[PDB]
Amino acid sequence: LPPRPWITLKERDSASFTVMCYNVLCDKYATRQLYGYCPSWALNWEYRKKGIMEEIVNCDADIISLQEVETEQYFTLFLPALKERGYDGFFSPKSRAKIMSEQERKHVDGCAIFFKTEKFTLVQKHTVEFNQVAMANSDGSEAMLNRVMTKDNIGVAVVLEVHKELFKQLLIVANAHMHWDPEYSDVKLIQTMMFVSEVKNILEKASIPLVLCADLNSLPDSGVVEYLSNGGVADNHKDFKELRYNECLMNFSRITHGFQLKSAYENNLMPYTNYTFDFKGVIDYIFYSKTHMNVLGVLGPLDPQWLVENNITGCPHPHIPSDHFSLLTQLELHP
Numbered sequence: 001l002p003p004r005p006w007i008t009l010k011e012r013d014s015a016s017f018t019v020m021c022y023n024v025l026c027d028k029y030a031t032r033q034l035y036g037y038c039p040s041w042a043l044n045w046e047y048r049k050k051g052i053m054e055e056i057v058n059c060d061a062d063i064i065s066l067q068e069v070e071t072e073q074y075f076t077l078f079l080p081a082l083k084e085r086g087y088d089g090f091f092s093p094k095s096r097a098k099i100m101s102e103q104e105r106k107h108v109d110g111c112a113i114f115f116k117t118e119k120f121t122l123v124q125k126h127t128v129e130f131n132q133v134a135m136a137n138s139d140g141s142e143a144m145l146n147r148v149m150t151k152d153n154i155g156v157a158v159v160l161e162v163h164k165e166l167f168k169q170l171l172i173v174a175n176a177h178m179h180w181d182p183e184y185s186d187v188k189l190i191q192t193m194m195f196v197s198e199v200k201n202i203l204e205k206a207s208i209p210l211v212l213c214a215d216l217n218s219l220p221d222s223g224v225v226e227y228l229s230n231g232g233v234a235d236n237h238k239d240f241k242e243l244r245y246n247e248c249l250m251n252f253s254r255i256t257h258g259f260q261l262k263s264a265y266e267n268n269l270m271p272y273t274n275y276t277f278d279f280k281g282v283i284d285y286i287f288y289s290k291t292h293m294n295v296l297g298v299l300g301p302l303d304p305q306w307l308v309e310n311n312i313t314g315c316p317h318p319h320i321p322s323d324h325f326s327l328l329t330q331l332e333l334h335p
């Protein structure tokens with residue numbers, strides 16, 4: 001497996017730091033039924049976690065956003081190992097409000113944000129529960145209650161002090177993992193607007209640059225990517241499927257947001273971020289405040305001719321420990 005190439009897009013000169021975004025594929029979902037093309041010994045977590053930790057250590061990012069972090073693995077694998085690489089972290093599982101056994105609680109996955117303490121100091125941490133926010137804004141929309149409220153997905157966000165020696169400067173890093181089902185573009189879009197409007201509220205109770213990492217489960221042509229990329233979306237966008245023109249959506253505000261985000265990866269520089277037999281596409285993203293930061297570089301994709309040479313039609317694989325590829329970008333923050 002050849003190393004992935006680092007790409008220089010723009011020359012330095014402010015502070016520069018790297019951000020990784022990575023869905024590690026949790027053990028619960030790494031099954032023969034979903035990934036029958038991958039041998040069971042290569043799906044097993046005691047094997048796969050080595051490649052996952054290797055990928056994270058090699059990327060060596062100043063800030064790390066992970067999805068599908070299982071609760072117990074956060075406390076016994078990721079955080080203890082990354083603490084030795086100079087990180088602290090913030091984790092939150094999905095499904096905190098759901099009743100379940102002690103054993104099941106250990107295996108619920110969530111989102112984690114790690115940051116190197118020599119460069120950042122955590123000032124606030126927050127968990128955004130999409131089901132609670134949907135429920136609180138569901139008046140007059142059966143679809144909000146039936147379709148959006150019933151999905152357990154979350155995002156997390158931290159407010160960080162960017163240390164002066166990298167140049168009281170603050171940055172917000174947000175990390176979310178949206179509902180997956182392709183028949184539910186309305187849920188994905190509403191979850192995205194809910195997350196962005198709740199992050200905006202985090203600002204006020206604290207303008208400030210944003211780095212938004214997420215497994216959006218949304219292709220680049222989607223309503224969520226347009227919403228994140230153009231600062232808003234019409235309320236009658238087709239991804240709402242009806243109720244398009246519903247008034248409850250304006251609570252998250254045409255529905256607009258004041259951020260001015262661009263994607264760190266822009267022109268299918270990676271042709272996909274999720275790579276399985278049945279589905280290949282870009283559904284993972286790193287967005288940043290374009291009026292505050294430049295992109296100085298990104299980590300290019302795994303050489304596709306190698307995947308071709310080795311007849312690899314889906315991941316994970318004995319030498320690729322997730323069905324997602326990591327995203328890694330170096331940003332340059334300007335006061």
Ligand SMILES: Nc1ccn([C@@H]2O[C@H](COP(=O)(O)O)[C@@H](O)[C@H]2O)c(=O)n1
Pocket residue numbers: 023180181182215217218219274276278279283
């Ligand atoms: N537009 C989209 C986005 C995701 N998906 C499905 O969701 C899967 C991704 O799941 P996760 O991102 O939650 O791991 C894909 O492999 C695919 O089966 C889809 O079928 N259509």
